[PDB]
C-alpha cells in the first residue's frame, strides 16, 4: 500500500485530540491523513492532507522526530504529533465531499480497542465509530506519558 501521512493535533491542555469524520467506507472518526504523492516528502504530505481535511496548516509546527507510526495490513501510517493547538481554532475542510465533520474528543474517553461479542458467544468485534483512530490511542497515550508525564 502507498504510505499515508497526517497528524494528531492536540489542544493546549493535552487532553483533547482533533478527529475528522469521513463518508461511506470512511464514515467514522479518524485522524486526518492521506496518501503520499510521487516525490512528496512525508512532512509535506502530512501538512497537505491535514490542510485539505481541516483547513489548518501544520507546516510551521511539525517536529520531525515526533510521530506515531503503525503498519496496518502492510500499509504504513505516520501521524505527526502537533500539541498546543487552541480549541477555539476554526477548522474547515477544503472538500465537504470527503469530510463530514471535524471535532475535538477527550483522549481519556476514546476507546483504545473495540469490544468483543463474548456476551453473544459470537466471534469478532462490535462496530465502533472510532475504528480508524483506535490503533493509535494506546501508542498516543504512552507517547504523551513519556514526553510530558
Ligand atoms: O486514523 C487513521 C486512519 C485509518 C484509516 N483511514 C483513516 N481515514 C481518515 C482520513 C480520511 C477522511 C476522514 C476519515 C479519517 N484514518
Curated annotation (Swiss-Prot):
Effect in UniProt of substituting residue 52 to Q: Loss of decapping activity
Motif (Nudix box): 34-55
Protein origin, superkingdom: Eukaryota
Organism: Homo sapiens (Human)
Compartments where found: Cytoplasm, P-body; Nucleus
Post-translational modification, as annotated: Phosphorylated at ser-249 in a MTOR-dependent manner.
Function: Decapping metalloenzyme that catalyzes the cleavage of the cap structure on mRNAs. Removes the 7-methyl guanine cap structure from mRNA molecules, yielding a 5'-phosphorylated mRNA fragment and 7m-GDP. Necessary for the degradation of mRNAs, both in normal mRNA turnover and in nonsense-mediated mRNA decay. Plays a role in replication-dependent histone mRNA degradation. Has higher activity towards mRNAs that lack a poly(A) tail. Has no activity towards a cap structure lacking an RNA moiety.
Tissue: Expressed in brain and testis. Not detected in heart (at protein level).
Protein name: m7GpppN-mRNA hydrolase
Bilayer-spanning residue ranges: none
Subunit field text: Found in a mRNA decay complex with LSM1, LSM3, LSM4, EXOSC2, EXOSC4, EXOSC10, PARN, XRN1, CNOT6, UPF1, UPF2 and UPF3B. Forms a complex with DCP1A, EDC3, DDX6 and EDC4/HEDLS, within this complex directly interacts with EDC4/HEDLS. Interacts with DPC1B. Interacts (via N-terminus and C-terminus) with TRIM21 (via N-terminus and C-terminus). Associates with polysomes. Interacts with LIMD1, WTIP and AJUBA. Interacts with DDX17 in an RNA-dependent manner. Interacts with ZC3HAV1. Interacts with APOBEC3G in an RNA-dependent manner. Interacts with ZFP36L1 (via N-terminus). Interacts with NBDY.
Range covered out of full length: 96 to 244 of 420
Annotated ranges, domain Nudix hydrolase: 1-131
Annotated effect of mutating residue 53 to Q: Strongly reduced decapping activity
Origin organism lineage: Eukaryota, Metazoa, Chordata, Craniata, Vertebrata
Amino-acid positions noted as binding Mn(2+) in the UniProt annotation, renumbered to this chain: 49, 53
Family stated for the protein in its record: Belongs to the Nudix hydrolase family. DCP2 subfamily.
